[PDB]
A paper describes a structure:
Fibrillarin (FBL) is an essential and evolutionarily highly conserved S-adenosyl methionine (SAM) dependent methyltransferase.
We selected 4 derivatives of 1, namely 1a, 1b, 1c, and 1d. This indicates that the extended D-phenylalanine moiety did not bind as well as the methionine portion of SAM, and was consequently exposed to the bulk solvent, which in turn affects the orientation of the fused bicyclic ring. Indeed, the binding affinity of 1a turned out to be similar to that of 1.
Numbering used by the authors: 86 to 99, 105 to 317
The structure:
Amino acid sequence: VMVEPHRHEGVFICALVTKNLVPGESVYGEKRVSISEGDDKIEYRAWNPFRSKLAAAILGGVDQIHIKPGAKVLYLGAASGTTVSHVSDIVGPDGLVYAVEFSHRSGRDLINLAKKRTNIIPVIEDARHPHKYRMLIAMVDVIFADVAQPDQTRIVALNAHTFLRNGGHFVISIKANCIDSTASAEAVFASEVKKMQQENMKPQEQLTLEPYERDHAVVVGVYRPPP
Ligand SMILES: NC(=O)Cc1cn2nc(C(F)(F)F)cc2c(=O)[nH]1
């Protein structure tokens, strides 16, 4: 066998690859590996950990990623769809990925990606004001975000309070240099974990992303709002 399933469901390994929901198409120039044995054919896409914090996290040995076939996902800061494309591969045609991006430039890449992928919903909106787009968002199982400013963990939490089910999960990368360049990476990470806790987003694991990123963490946890 030439592509083995990874511990994480929907993730495969040769290095890290996902099953291409759109056979024949690359999203960001990634290699595509197709394996045929008779009439059976399956195409995978290379998942670059120097571009995608999530792939770096999986390679780094993260225990859970909480996306699987059928999962409903809210991705804040979807940019041009790099990481979202692979989340879309994993959740498959019965899952759903809401891809929120403020940038209109990035948004056009996202809409283009979503033309081919029925499970992506581009939402070209400011995640600071979820009320503007709340009527489009069915309640999700998992939220993803890259936090790069000192206000963004709260912005993620306001979206969790609006859209994330009780007992759903979050996967949040943290770019310490962008949050506070005058603080140590460790102090930024502790401060962001504390901001999470104060919003009932309870971390369950965390890791840094060396060698792919410097002073970049990924935190995985569970949302436990009060009644
Ligand atoms: N040009 C930009 O504004 C990039 C960007 C950052 N960004 N951060 C979040 C947050 F993490 F807060 F959820 C959501 C977004 C997003 O839509 N776009």
